[PDB]
Symmetry: D2
Subunit: 289 residues, 4 copies
């Protein structure tokens, strides 16, 4: 049976969960990588059944979402040596161990073997609520460290543990290509680098492992992280539902099925791409009223 | 049960056929639209089992094979010279409008539309030496044809229905050899894919995309100018994936593009070319 | 002194004029190609000094010739347009004819400008456009650029330069810019690349296109499309300047100068930066 | 008379120097920011008239260039408070002071007044010789701090000290948009962020200061930096000279004159842009033989 590691799921409200669901539709088992400060919170809501409501696969619990494992993961660190004394001291990291990208890499591979799929649905900006102009070297590089370099780290450590013909997917946002005031802290710069890095990784992973990698430029989803920004997320959504060529409402599962498709053998000739999943809003010049 | 009309198949060596195959895999019934000057030959091949080897997916279910000339929007457009032409006389209802009426009357609303046709008489000429008539014909048969298909079919299409066409990267990067305004036609078709996505999306909740395919030894590709053998070899040498590109590779992306699983994708140019388009140039 | 041929000026309220003006600042002489059905009126208003207002800085106009970019050479003109009152007074107006006429009188020129479009169904949506309307938009607005280059480039100086004007509805959906015009503009930008390859290798001639913002030109005024677009550009572009005919003109002048001799095949945005925005910034 | 501050320059073999030259012929006065480690040498080269021939502009001989001033500048530091101790006690800096970004900006405003023009021609990355996949987070983030964030810091520190309608330009390279093996260390990512940043900065500089920013995507130049990587640069120059639509050799003043134009009021309505000065190589699909 096939497996996909989904780095960056903190609850059932994000894109990673939506991706997990659609992979369930085609019988691949999911391993989540959870950011440590919310790892217990999560494994708790999962034990109690708060997500059973969300593990329904359209045929209503005749088919379940197979969560093979859940692990602590801080893609901010590539291996143990990188971990600083203080984060080892933190009350949220005391309990937990083996959570560097290499740690979870090795762990999964030592137990489950080679896997086929790999998802990167995480990101973080310290100063996301600052304009790129008012952003500091530290915040900027933090955004980029957490949101861009993290994909590279994942590939480096995972892709030698993956099946030939395997596939990697990440999420991005169009602020990398067109100015969205409000998407700040160098998050636009991070996405811009992610997109570029997707191509360059496609070449190395393609030639070395025959592995594919693509990124989905998603439309606005009211996830937890999204919510953070005086409701920048509500505006992007009402702007989208109003002016997209497709007046539908965007679901996590819309991105979910495109990821599932990108992760399958059905797209074995597509690599290095930014595929837009935003109800066609990227094609528009502006509001059509 | 879902139906797709595939305009632009004349044998089993091109992309239309590969898309048909992949659509059969998910139980989609296929109607072929066939250029009349090649129609009776294609039907004979079919009838005598030449394509049987190539029908194996069990086997592809061809619901119908109709004559279609994507240069004619309706009956009145058809000149007498072709109405009197050896290869059209016995054939009727081959306007874009007439086959859309035909198909609609015989089967009702369809859900999927495939455009996989192109034509340009001066593709041997550099753009620079291409004539106004060559250039315009290339754009008439390869770009306008797409708008007309949509204009005539999309009244007769199920909401949430989907349209895909084929393109080539010659539109965005200079490929010498790809002439007669074919590079211009592909360009217009990519832009047109956008604009139709707005009108088709708002009006009928219909999606339209285009696949930028890599090189494939189709009969058309072969008729160009040794050129395609060079493009195939260059692709298999320098793509990120060194796999060999198959019609079914484009086929499965089209199928995905023609299904509700991509119901938030529209107006897009998708590259199915083994990653070739991301490279700067040769890596040796 | 260097010469620039500018096709697509029927008045002074457009981009072609702005390009002339800015070129005049550089001591480059200028030839106008004019759509015959307005050549008689243009020459008159130029007679009466009606244009002396805008000509000043002085714009030295070498010649004004009737040019119909619908016809590539003499034999393409059909019986009917020959027998039309709009043209009657005028001959030698095919792309080839004015190219020969210009070379015979002046020799090789250094600069070429394409600033003309037309389509007869620009009023209809792309989906509502017909084959003949669509193909007309493309013939006039797009192929013509290739016909100019084919005919003028053998008569140009090694190191010569060509520019045309385009609009962003080729890359992003602009309802209102219909009739296959978005379509013609998409071709034009692509063609700018392929042309750059051939012209560059064959004659060392560069070619670029400018993607310009809204201007209240004559042609723009028949669509209230352009009024809407100017308000939108002035409200949401990164720069608040009102866009000037001569802003495009000044980038043009640059592109036609040896100061840009490493730039070719490009689409250059001269639109106060508007292209770069996701949407209205309120 | 207008003044331009040119960041990355150190020997007249590069593009910073080429921009200097072409601004010169427009009678603009030029100031050099120079990386401290190479600063003493550059001034000893210059005051001994070694670049005396490179300062010549038609008419020749001659009509020379005249450098208003030359400062030390480490664009990897935003303000004094940043510059650490190890570096305070480094053989190259114990001899220099006021080289932080804000330090040099303040020094210039004080002494010269507001300036019209700003040029970013600086870049650096410790691990460029590594493929993106094999690149560490430190090397990667270094590439991006020095090569990209610099553009932002400069802009943050100079914008209030700049004339209304002032212009800024940086240099990029197509490896950000198409895979260029050999361009490792996260430089490709750096340039992608840079290009994206150019757009975002154009929004903020344009609204708040009526200030323009563009970047130039240049073709290969046998500069000192490009020399470092079995000659990546010789291959790239040859490739370009063979296959570009225009067969000429590309000179630092080719980019210099495009920059001078972008830095002048002739490009009044051009901002946010990536402009290609590469003899058209960017447009070709591949080798046309
Ligand atoms: N939501 C949208 O509107 C939208 C649009 C386009 C793209 N995206 C992208 O989709 C992806 C998923 O975002 P989402 O909206 O589902 O957010 P989310 O809040 O559902 O998921 C983000 C998760 O990443 C994890 N994370 C944060 N920092 C981490 C770190 N340092 N190490 C390891 N894990 C960390 C957190 O556990 C968090 O739950 C992100 O990359 C985002 O940029 C989102
Ligand atoms: N083969 C490749 O390498 C390649 C690569 C990229 C894109 N494409 C595109 O894929 C599409 C399919 O082409 P293909 O390579 O399968 O070639 P093909 O020869 O298999 O198919 C082209 C079809 O169009 C038909 N046709 C021509 N003129 C017509 C008209 N006026 N009306 C109706 N039909 C007409 C031909 O009979 C033929 O069946 C084309 O648009 C082509 O441009 C092909
Ligand atoms: N005005 C704008 O807002 C705008 C924006 C972007 C691009 N453009 C482009 O700039 C160019 C100039 O247009 P404009 O806005 O200055 O309008 P304009 O009226 O100044 O230019 C149109 C010119 O083309 C001429 N013309 C029409 N058909 C012709 C033919 N068959 N042969 C020769 N000439 C013909 C007209 O007589 C007129 O002189 C066009 O290519 C246009 O698409 C304009
Ligand atoms: N050389 C090329 O082929 C080429 C092509 C396209 C773009 N570029 C870009 O143009 C710019 C100039 O490069 P070049 O080719 O002139 O190389 P160069 O070596 O001539 O110039 C680079 C300058 O940056 C300086 N520098 C290095 N680290 C610095 C730091 N931490 N702080 C401040 N300054 C620092 C160097 O000392 C040098 O003066 C670079 O950004 C480069 O990426 C170069
Ligand atoms: O990428 C996103 C795009 C949008 Cl429209 C909404 C939310 C997104 O996700 C994030 C945005 C900023 C930060 Cl700091 C972290 C995350 Cl996960
Ligand atoms: O688009 C194509 C791209 C490639 Cl690489 C090969 C063949 C292609 O298809 C055509 C090319 C020219 C003409 Cl006249 C007709 C068609 Cl169908
Ligand atoms: O290209 C243009 C773009 C804009 Cl915003 C405004 C006017 C334009 O110019 C034209 C538009 C349509 C037609 Cl039929 C002819 C011309 Cl000259
Ligand atoms: O960007 C460049 C592109 C090219 Cl083709 C050549 C040199 C370049 O400049 C650099 C390349 C690498 C590093 Cl580490 C630093 C610099 Cl300044």
């Amino acid at each position: 049976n096939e497996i996909c590691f989904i780095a960056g799921v903190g609850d059932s409200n994000g894109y990673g969960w939506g991706i997990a669901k659609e992979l369930s539709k085609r019988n691949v088992k999911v391993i989540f990588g959870v950011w440590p400060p919310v790892y217990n919170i999560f494994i708790k809501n999962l034990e109690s059944g708060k997500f059973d409501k969300d593990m329904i696969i359209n045929n209503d619990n005749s088919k379940r979402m197979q969560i093979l494992d859940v692990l602590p993961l801080d893609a901010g660190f590539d291996n143990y040596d990188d971990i600083d004394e203080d984060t080892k001291n933190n009350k949220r990291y005391n309990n937990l161990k083996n959570y560097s990208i290499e740690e979870v890499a090795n762990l999964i591979y030592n137990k489950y073997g080679k896997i086929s799929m790999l998802v990167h649905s995480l990101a973080n900006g310290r100063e996301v609520q600052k304009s790129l102009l008012d952003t500091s070297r530290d915040g900027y590089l933090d955004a980029i460290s957490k949101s861009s370099y993290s994909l590279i780290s994942l590939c480096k450590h995972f892709c030698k543990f993956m099946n030939s013909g395997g596939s990697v997917v990440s999420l991005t946002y169009q602020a990398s290509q067109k100015v969205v005031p409000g998407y700040g802290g160098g998050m636009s710069s991070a996405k811009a680098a992610l997109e570029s890095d997707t191509r360059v990784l496609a070449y190395y992973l393609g030639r070395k492992y025959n592995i594919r990698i693509n990124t989905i430029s998603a439309g606005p989803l009211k996830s937890r992280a999204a919510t953070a920004i005086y409701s920048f997320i509500d505006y992007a959504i009402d702007y989208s539902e109003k002016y997209a060529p497709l007046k539908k409402k965007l679901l996590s599962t819309d991105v979910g099925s495109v990821a599932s498709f990108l992760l399958s053998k059905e797209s074995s000739a597509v690599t290095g791409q930014t595929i837009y999943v935003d109800n066609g809003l990227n094609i528009m010049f502006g509001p059509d009223d």
